[PDB]
């Protein structure tokens, strides 16, 4: 059974403007495993991105963690872009520290 991905965007540590942090994008619960995940800076693909191994559980289906180093700023800018066969077009989820 096909499952659209669950996407969670958050920082590793509490966000403080001007201080180095890590922007996380956790994608889980999707099937099949073919997926596209990118971290964005005003829609621009961030190129220095790391990611965990593609893992699978019988309960969570497939999951995957992307993360990059970033420095939060006053403005709203950072987001995650996920593309999947269950999506007609790439889905962008903006980062919100109050969320």
């Amino acid at each position, epitope marked *: 059974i096909q499952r659209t991905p669950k996407i969670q965007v958050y920082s590793r540590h509490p966000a403080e403007n001007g201080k180095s942090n890590f922007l996380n994008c956790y994608v889980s619960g999707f099937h099949p495993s073919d997926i*596209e995940v*990118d971290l*964005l800076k*005003n*829609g*621009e*693909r961030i*190129e220095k991105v790391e990611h965990s191994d593609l893992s699978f559980s019988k309960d969570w289906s497939f999951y995957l963690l992307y993360y990059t180093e970033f420095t939060p*700023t006053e*403005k709203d800018e950072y*987001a995650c*872009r996920v*593309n999947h066969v269950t999506l007609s*077009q*790439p889905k*962008i989820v903006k980062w919100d520290r109050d969320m």
Partner: antibody
Amino acid sequence: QLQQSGAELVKPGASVKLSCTPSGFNVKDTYIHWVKQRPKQGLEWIGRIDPSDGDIKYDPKFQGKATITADTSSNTVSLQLSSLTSEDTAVYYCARWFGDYGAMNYWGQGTSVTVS
Amino acid sequence: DIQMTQSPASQSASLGESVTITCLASQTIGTWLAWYQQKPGKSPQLLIYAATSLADGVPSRFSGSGSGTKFSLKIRTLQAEDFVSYYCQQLYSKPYTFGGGTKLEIK
């Protein structure tokens, strides 16, 4: 709308500065790209600037020739071309980035630069 | 630097016919690909973003397809305004290189 400055006709070896001024939004709101197009030839990506934090990226082959700047006090992004030769004769477009698209959705009319 | 091999370089067709333009990336770029159209006397204009999504105002006879390294631009039922230039562009890794372009000519 992305207003661009008037056409330029200059001698070889001179310098020129093309300006790109948006109407309806601030330069600090998005990325401004610059594209070169020789007469009857294809498109060439030069670089782009984030005027909100001054991040600039260039195509490596344009680093010695082109210099992108921003005057946020005047809501203007500029592209400077120096030591002009015949190969620099082209139309230079400035394009506005749209994050939800992941591409440049609106382009300016372009500034024609003629090197005699 | 990522290379984009756009083919064909030139194509001729008649009104109503269909055309397919292909762009090949030198490495996987996912769906970070845009298609632009350039008409005589105009700036380039966005047709397709994210490989398959139409921009506002673009007619439904324009179709984008592909993922990874091979991408396609399909134009059905060609009218006079469509016989212009088309360029693909990768937005995966800077520099955001363009394709060589394709000029559509009438019969």
